[PDB]
């Protein structure tokens, strides 16, 4: 029997620093989790104690907080290396600054392989990009050797900025292949390390012939076996087994997000390859683990350049303001009807009217804590709207509305980010209804009236609609906004508008009041 | 047969100038109504063409717009004059600047006399006031005589400030000695002329022995024969018919408010004085009536002091803001949600925090126009809320919220004050149901929760309610919440609360969003 430890992290999205339970900005010490130095200390702790480990990332490191805004990557590089990642497989969210944006901060400063086995790249780039980024690494692991096959979603050229020179391929034919010429040369143990989401890493486990293991990410998907640590409840099992089309028992593993835990597996494998069985769990990266004295005192050090961005109070808030998946992605959030209000009222102090707004709900991407005596900062905005994308104004016809409402939970129950925030817009749902006809009632404040109040949505109408320029490009499967709409005016940036709405207001309170409802029947 | 024609005004409530027809500014003139110089005009037509006329006011030209605000009732004694009134009875908004306030603007300016016989003066008070005002006058009307008993509200003490010195009496015990007197003294001719509203007046019509004729206020009633000229419905024909406990057929008159109308009944009186008929109409004071030039000048003159508060613009509104009694004393009205949001954001910037806000709407006395370039000034502000109350902070249990919630409704119809518009709270009523057990639900926004939500309201539980001081000292009926109340702090002032909220908004959008909903059942 030989053993081998695999220690995973996924998502982890610029949370460098110790964060608050909900994965926002770290207020109070004591209870705070995760971060690269808390998550040293772990993985040392491993190290000593089992000869055979394996460190990976399955990709979206970048993007999150401001440490991605203000060091674009080379942070990434940076800890990753101090950490001893032994592979990363890339993923979406690495493309968000270009190739440009991966090849200088990344790929040339990390000590560590960067794979994935399905982006070809065409033209110009193949040349440069060749060799920077692997199909696979082989890598030596005490007397044996584990071959590492990559992969990142075939949605990154609609979800990111890869260009028109990077190519994405199915997942499961382009690594098939890549497993197949690890067979050749006598790799015997082979894990699939990549960032597709939970469902495409089942299928991988299913029908890639000689994947032992997959190692995944893009779903935040948390893995449970027993009663779990904080307040994550598990899809599933950890590790979740898949019964390969060969026979085989494939564990599949993921650690849901935010460096908030560390995966830990733990594989027993027969001479020849074959896992004979596998356990473990994900690691709470908690106050009970200390952080590492030598990280932490680097962390302060990079920390001195993004303090200019936690000095400027733009308001205050005496309600939690609720920028959860768990909340933001099922049901209306209060942190969705404050965006979606900044939104309305921007354009109502702009010129040339407009009463209603969408957001997609997955578009909010932290939580704010009303704890800290209420301050909100540039850089507690700057997790909730990291992606730089415009609040614009578009004209849509009363049809169109109800389909983007009805696409909205067309697929409701997977934390899925098309669920709409709202503003100026009451919509009732009724999830007992097939999908395409789940939308029971949707109101809208009128426009062609002296007093606005709500009245019934008309199909043959035409409404003005403020919402991200993320929608109004057909993002999140709302094709029939891009394709429908009459009329498209190009915003103002996300997070200024936010900022300046707060800094008017000073202090806010926005509550869940209605906007969105499910019916009982 | 002798003919006497009565004109009458009543509830003029400073509006001096022609208004819009909801009787707030005056923005496009050609389609403008009311005003002195208007009337003017029509009473002297009508003086030309009758021999018998009587021009009579029943109260409340206090109060209302910024020309008693910067005059104090100046204005009243000098145009009433000018339009050569010929009596008026005190209302209760003639005491809102103490005795004081009505001594020396009015009572020793007035060229007519002014009267109440229920209104007796003790103590210190008694000796100056003697004779300023009279119980009745007997007026000379060509070669006949007519007499004019005065009456005011028995609820002034409450609803004004008349002072300690001052007693009110019930105004049929206090009418029927000096009506007595003038038959003693062979006059055949009486008319009533006060200020205690439509119901009342019936009452008198049906009890005070000898009283020919009811001219009435403070109920703001519009009465018509015939299809009506403008946007007020009828509460019954002009003249309304009593007929008395004695068997005489009494008409019964008022018209309406803020000077829209002039009212005009025809009576034909025998020898001995019994009215064998009459009729008329209010007659609407429209465009097609030219404005007196030489008053319009005058207007003018005294409209140059004023423009000081029509300078300065507070911000912008882009929908009309339905400040009228027609919608804020029935159901929810966008001024009372602009004045309800103002009043939770005004505390929620102050220090030691309340999300819910009740507001009687009656103390909302005007709209005003999006029109105008949506412009909004002090001026405009100061006819919504002229007053000059204050919005304070209390403390109630459920059950005393729930009471007032009932009392809102329990006489609903009638165009009384009390309904309550809001802030923070859902409230359904089911008005199938008797008075007291008409509120079917009422959510509030909880207070302890870190993410406001509505939830249902609490008997046991203590909530933080912002509110006028005229509601938190009992008035409207509200007993319970003086009686009941666990804490009261003094509040600012309520133009200035809203005009802060206008010009930080810059632009407002007030909608009607479901806070106060009717169930059908
Ligand atoms: N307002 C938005 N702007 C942008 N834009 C692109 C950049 N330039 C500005 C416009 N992208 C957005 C927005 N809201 C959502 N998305 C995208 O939708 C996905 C959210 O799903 P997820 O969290 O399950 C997948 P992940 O993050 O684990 O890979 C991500 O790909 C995210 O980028
Ligand atoms: N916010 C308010 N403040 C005050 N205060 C008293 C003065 N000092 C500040 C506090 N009074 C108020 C408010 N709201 C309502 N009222 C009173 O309720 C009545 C409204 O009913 P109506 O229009 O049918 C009777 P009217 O006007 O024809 O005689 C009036 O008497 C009015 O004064
Ligand atoms: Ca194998
Ligand atoms: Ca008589
Ligand atoms: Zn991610
Ligand atoms: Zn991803
Ligand atoms: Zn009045
Ligand atoms: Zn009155």
């Not at 590492?292 to 939690?320: C, F, H, M």
Request: with cysteine.
């Amino acid at each position: 029997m030989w053993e081998l430890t695999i220690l995973h992290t996924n998502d982890v999205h610029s949370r460098l620093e110790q964060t608050s339970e909900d994965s926002s900005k770290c207020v109070d010490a004591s209870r705070c989790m995760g971060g690269v130095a808390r998550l040293f200390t772990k993985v040392q702790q491993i190290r000593r104690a089992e000869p055979n480990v394996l460190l990976l990332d399955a990709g979206d490191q970048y993007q999150g907080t401001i440490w991605f805004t203000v060091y674009k990557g080379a942070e990434v590089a940076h800890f990753m290396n101090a950490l001893r990642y032994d592979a990363m497989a890339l993923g979406n969210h690495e493309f968000d600054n270009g190739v440009e944006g991966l090849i200088e901060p990344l790929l040339k400063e990390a000590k560590f392989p960067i794979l994935s086995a399905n982006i070809k790249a065409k033209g110009p780039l193949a040349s440069q990009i060749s060799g920077l980024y692997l199909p696979y690494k082989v890598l030596p692991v005490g007397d044996e050797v584990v071959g590492i096959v990559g992969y990142t979603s075939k949605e990154t050229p609609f979800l990111s900025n890869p260009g028109t020179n990077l190519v994405f391929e199915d997942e499961i034919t382009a690594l098939q292949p890549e497993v197949d010429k690890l067979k050749t040369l006598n790799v015997n143990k082979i894990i699939a390390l990549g960032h597709s989401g939970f469902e495409m890493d089942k299928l991988i486990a299913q029908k890639v012939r000689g994947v032992d293991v997959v190692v995944g990410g893009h779903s935040n998907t948390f893995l449970y076996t027993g009663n779990p640590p904080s307040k994550e409840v598990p899809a599933g099992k950890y590790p979740f087994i898949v019964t390969s089309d060969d026979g085989r028992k494939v564990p599949v593993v993921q650690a849901y997000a935010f460096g908030k835990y560390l995966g830990y597996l733990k594989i027993e494998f027969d001479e020849r390859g074959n896992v004979i069985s596998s356990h473990g769990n994900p690691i709470l990266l908690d106050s009970s683990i200390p952080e590492d004295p030598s990280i932490k005192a680097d962390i302060n050090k990079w920390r001195i350049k993004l303090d200019d961005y936690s000095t400027q109070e733009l308001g205050k808030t005496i309600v939690y303001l609720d920028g959860s998946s768990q909340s933001c992605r099922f049901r209306e959030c209060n942190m969705g009807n404050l965006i979606c209000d900044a939104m309305i009222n921007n354009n109502l102090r702009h010129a040339d009217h407009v009463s209603m707004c969408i957001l997609n709900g997955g578009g909010i991407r932290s939580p704010i804590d009303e704890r800290n005596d209420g301050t909100i900062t540039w850089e507690n905005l700057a997790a909730v709207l990291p992606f730089g994308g415009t609040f614009d104004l578009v004209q849509l016809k009363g049809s169109t509305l109800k389909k983007a409402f009805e696409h909205s939970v067309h697929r409701y129950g997977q934390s899925t980010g098309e669920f709409l925030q709202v503003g100026g817009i009451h919509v009732v749902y009724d999830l007992s209804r097939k999908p395409g006809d789940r939308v029971v009632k949707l109101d809208v404040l009128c426009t062609k009236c002296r007093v606005p109040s709500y009245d019934p949505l008309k199909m043959d109408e035409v409404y003005k609609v403020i919402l991200p320029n993320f929608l109004a490009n057909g993002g999140d499967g709302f094709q029939m906004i891009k394709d429908e709409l009459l009329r498209h005016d190009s915003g103002d940036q996300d997070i200024n508008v936010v900022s300046t709405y707060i800094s008017k207001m000073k202090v806010i309170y926005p509550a869940v009041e209605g906007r969105i409802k499910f019916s009982l029947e």
